[PDB]
Structures are given as structure tokens and as C-alpha cells.
From Swiss-Prot, chains A, B:
Effect of L149V: Alters substrate specificity
Source superkingdom: Eukaryota
Assembly with partners or alone: Homodimer. Exists predominantly as a homodimer but also exits as monomer.
Protein name: 17-beta-hydroxysteroid dehydrogenase type 1
Annotated binding of NADP(+), by residue: 9-37, 65, 159
Catalytic activity: 17beta-estradiol + NAD(+) = estrone + NADH + H(+); 17beta-estradiol + NADP(+) = estrone + NADPH + H(+); testosterone + NADP(+) = androst-4-ene-3,17-dione + NADPH + H(+)
Enzyme active site: Y155 (proton acceptor)
Family: Belongs to the short-chain dehydrogenases/reductases (SDR) family.
Organism, scientific name: Homo sapiens (Human)
Gene, per the UniProt record: HSD17B1
E.C. code: 1.1.1.51, 1.1.1.62
Residues the record lists as Phosphoserine modifications: S134
Keywords: Cytoplasm, Lipid biosynthesis, Lipid metabolism, NADP, Oxidoreductase, Phosphoprotein, Steroid biosynthesis
Molecular function, one GO term: small molecule binding
């Protein structure tokens, strides 16, 4: 009997590639429920399933919208085996811009998806793992959940919020046989300017499109294959005593060293200001 | 007038005490706007103010509910000086419990008050500080924002979120002349047991009560007074170049240094499990 996997946010990126990576695994150990907010976006996932030739029955799609605890319950029930061995909380939104230019609705949505969404999935699925005494939870983490990034203020808030949610749980889950791990990802290959101008000062406006210039270049240098990222999830699954945190790259570990060296936080602020601007 | 300070969450606790501390300064250096979710609760604040003979016009109250961006904008407009020199984001909620046992709404309230509420203040008050080239922001933080605490998953999520919000902002804010600081509080003085078993499991139920007993005894030994913490906001207030973070206590700097040491997190997790579950 196979390892049942359920994964959120499989329409693209990490979730897509991780789902087909598990379904197509030559061992045929994995039964994957790939869940999508909107089933109409499932096309690239089935293209990829065939290109890696996932066996029939190895991959199924469910609608699961992490904003809606009813969508969550209903997908849980569509799990024919009636347990989950591996849960991957991958679903996530980004949000980029000067804080004062972000809509209130966009800010709340990011917290609701990235943070509350993950709470909803843990509330539906964690008890059964606890009762049974086994299960793996993997949560897609970010470099921005480790260190703040200018103009990603709310994104980082949500990603730090996961660090805090997951670390708290993990302390409780240490002796339960349920293993929670975060997978810390750097960049990965998967308002319009007058609204931005109206809602902010001239100097922030300049610094923002400066930041976008710098950001795009880092992304060209720095963005990983998502197959390579997916494989780290695999590494974590295979681990018999998995750590709370895995990292998909070492590129950002120097900065993380320095930031945690200095517990009043001002070293990090200068270095990152410098790295990003000039 | 003076140094204009606006403080949220001033009906009791840190906010009430910082408000009167500042209003009763013998230099009369400070004009304090103490804001309350509900002005009808302003009884205790004014009692304290008179107890310290705060001069007239040293202290004023406004209604400000950090869940309503319109409440926020109305209170901004009421600042007759048309500037704020020190903004104190202090409004905060706790949530204690096994995750699966907390209501969805309670969870979303905490994030909306603690995180989104603070975003709304930053959105409303930072623009004028940037354009003016000056300003301080002080934010009530927590050791629970720097290390995960069991059964406080959502509280911690909310406090880690503030870490990421403020750090991201600070990197941008360095050339603008606007300083952001978190005041890292430790603990601070101010369903039925079958419902818990019912919504949770047997291992969890045991851990929870073990936790309750354990943490009572940290509150007896460790809990600082609101006045002591208020005093650390003053240091930060005054500092010629304030750091990103200030600590109110030494006590948890060991448990914290085990976290920063092992980025994998396995050291911190085992430590805190032992420290808590004994
Ligand atoms: C978990 C804890 C008890 C509860 C404390 C607590 C409680 C409330 C709060 O707002 C912050 C904190 C921070 C420290 C926490 C302690 C660390 C060691 C311990 O046993």
C-alpha cells in the first residue's frame, strides 16, 4: 500500500513539479492528490504527468481552495484511502510593492492564503496523523521567511508567520511520530506604475523600480530548476529523523549567518540595504 | 508643540503606562495621543494620568480600531500638529491552545489585529514620515516572535510576522531617516478540558495541561511589569540611532542562542521541548 500524498497549489511551479516527481517515481510508492484552487488550470499538470509518464492511478486532481475550510473538508473526504501520509502545504501568494501602495484587500488575502490557509490544512489533516502516530508535513518556506526583503514587506510577514507557526507546532510534535519540516527556497523558475506613483512619494517610486531592476538580475543569476527544488522535498521525506528546516540553496546562508550573529538586527539592515541598492 | 507620540492599545497595560509615563515627563517634551479601540474604556487611562498630574494638553485620547482603516485615517487627521514623531504600534491579541481546537475566526482576528492592524498604521503614518525625512516607529514585539512556543502557534505566527514586516521596511527606510524598532517583551503581568480532548487527541491533551502548569510557573518567576517594559520603549525612543530590536529581559537569550546556532532548527526544537515539558 502506497504513501498517500496531498499537495496544495499544484497548478504551477514547485507544487506542479513535486506532484509529478512523486507520482512518476520508479518505486511507484506514491499516491498523489494534487490539489488546485481552480481545476481549469490543471492543464500544465497533466502535460507534465504524461511527459514523465506517471502510471495510471498515481495522480489525481482535487479542487482545494485554502481560503475556504469547506473546500478543505470536501477534498479531505475525496481521499479514498481515508488517510494522508504526506501533506505538502505549498499553496502561496506573493505581493510586491511599497507598503503604502498595497491595497488592504491584497494584504489580507496574502495572510489569509499563506498563513490562515496553512492553519486550515493543519486543522483538517494534523489530528489524524497525531491519532495514528505517523505522518509527514512539508511546508514550502522562503528566503523571505528568514530575512526581510524591501518592498516584500507583507510577503515576508506571511513567510515569517509560517516559520513561527511551524516551529511552534514542531516543538509539540517532536515525540508524536509526526514530522513537520520547512523547505526554504530562494527564487525559482516556474499595481500599474501610475497607481504606484499616485500612492507613494517620488523617492520610494525611484527606489522601487530600482529594486525591480536589481531583483530581475538576481533572478536571472539565481533562480533554480523546480525539479531540483522538488527533489529536496524528496530528501526530507526519505530522511528517518527529518530536521525542521531544509534549504534548497546555500547562496543565502552567509547572510543568514550574519543576521543571526547580531541580535539587535542593524548589521543585517545595512548589508541588505547595500546588497540591494548599489 | 513638542515630540508628538501616538500610541495604540492604551486602555491598559504597556500602552496605558507608556502614555502616562510620557505625558508626565517634567520637561513636558511630549504630546501624547493615546488611542483606544473603544473610547468608553478610557476610565483607567485618565485615572492614571491624574495620579501623575499629567498637564492639560500633554495627553489626548482618540478612538482608533486597528481593524478599520477608516478608524485609522480619522485618528490620523485628528493630530492637530499635522505630524507624528513617534508611532507606537502596540495593539495586540493572544491565542492559547492546541491549533485544531481554535476557531477559524479567532485565528483570523488575531492576524488581523496583530499583523494587518500594524500594516494599516504603517500605511497611514509612514508616508508623512518619509516626505519629512524623519520619524520613529516603536512596535510591541515578543520573544514568541523570535522563537516558536508550543500551544501559541498563532500568537507566534503573528509576532514572527511583525519581525518580517518591520525588518523588510527597515532596509527600505534607512535613506529616508525613518527608524523602526521592535521591543521584544517576554511574558508580562496583567473551552473546558473535555472539549479539548474531544477536538484534539490523548498525547496532545496531556502535553497541553503539562504546558499550562509549566507556563504558570514561568509567569510567576519571569513576568515583567508593564512599567518596566514601558521603560525600555523610552530607551528606544531616546536612542540617537535606535537598533531594529531591543530586549526587555536577559532570561531567554540562552534558548534564543540555541536557535540562531542551528539553522536546521533541530537543536532549538529539542531544547524548547525539554525546557517546557521537563
Ligand atoms: C514557553 C515559556 C512559557 C511562556 C512564555 C511566554 C508567555 C507569553 C508571552 O506573550 C511570551 C512568552 C515568552 C516566553 C515563554 C516561555 C519560554 C519558556 C517557557 O516555558
Amino acid at each position: 500500500a502506497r504513501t498517500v500524498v496531498l499537495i496544495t497549489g499544484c497548478s504551477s511551479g514547485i507544487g506542479l513539479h513535486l506532484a509529478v516527481r512523486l507520482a512518476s517515481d520508479p518505486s511507484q510508492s506514491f499516491k498523489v492528490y494534487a490539489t488546485l484552487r481552480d481545476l481549469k488550470t490543471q492543464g500544465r499538470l497533466w502535460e507534465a504527468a504524461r511527459a514523465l509518464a506517471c502510471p495510471p492511478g498515481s495522480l489525481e486532481t482535487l479542487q482545494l481552495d485554502v481560503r475556504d475550510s469547506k473546500s478543505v473538508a470536501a477534498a479531505r473526504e475525496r481521499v479514498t484511502e481515508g488517510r494522508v501520509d504526506v501533506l505538502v502545504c505549498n499553496a502561496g501568494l506573493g505581493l510586491l510593492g511599497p507598503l503604502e501602495a498595497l491595497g488592504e484587500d491584497a494584504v489580507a488575502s496574502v495572510l489569509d492564503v499563506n498563513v490562515v490557509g496553512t492553519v486550515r490544512m493543519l486543522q483538517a489533516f494534523l489530528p489524524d496523523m497525531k491519532r495514528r502516530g505517523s505522518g509527514r508535513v512539508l511546508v514550502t518556506g522562503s528566503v523571505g521567511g528568514l530575512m526581510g526583503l524591501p518592498f516584500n514587506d507583507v510577503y515576508c510577514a506571511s513567510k515569517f508567520a509560517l516559520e513561527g507557526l511551524c516551529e511552534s507546532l514542531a516543538v509539540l510534535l517532536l515525540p508524536f511520530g509526526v514530522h513537520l519540516s520547512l523547505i526554504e527556497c530562494g527564487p525559482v523558475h516556474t499595481g500599474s506604475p501610475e497607481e504606484v506613483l499616485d500612492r507613494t512619494d517620488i523617492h520610494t517610486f525611484h527606489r522601487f523600480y530600482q529594486y525591480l531592476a536589481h531583483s530581475k538580475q538576481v533572478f536571472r543569476e539565481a533562480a533554480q530548476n523546480p525539479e531540483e527544488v522538488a527533489e529536496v522535498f524528496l530528501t526530507a521525506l526519505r530522511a528517518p529523523k527529518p530536521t525542521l528546516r531544509y534549504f534548497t540553496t546555500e547562496r543565502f546562508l552567509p547572510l543568514l549567518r550574519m543576521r543571526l550573529d547580531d541580535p539587535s538586527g542593524s548589521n543585517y539592515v545595512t548589508a541588505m540595504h547595500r546588497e540591494v541598492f548599489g
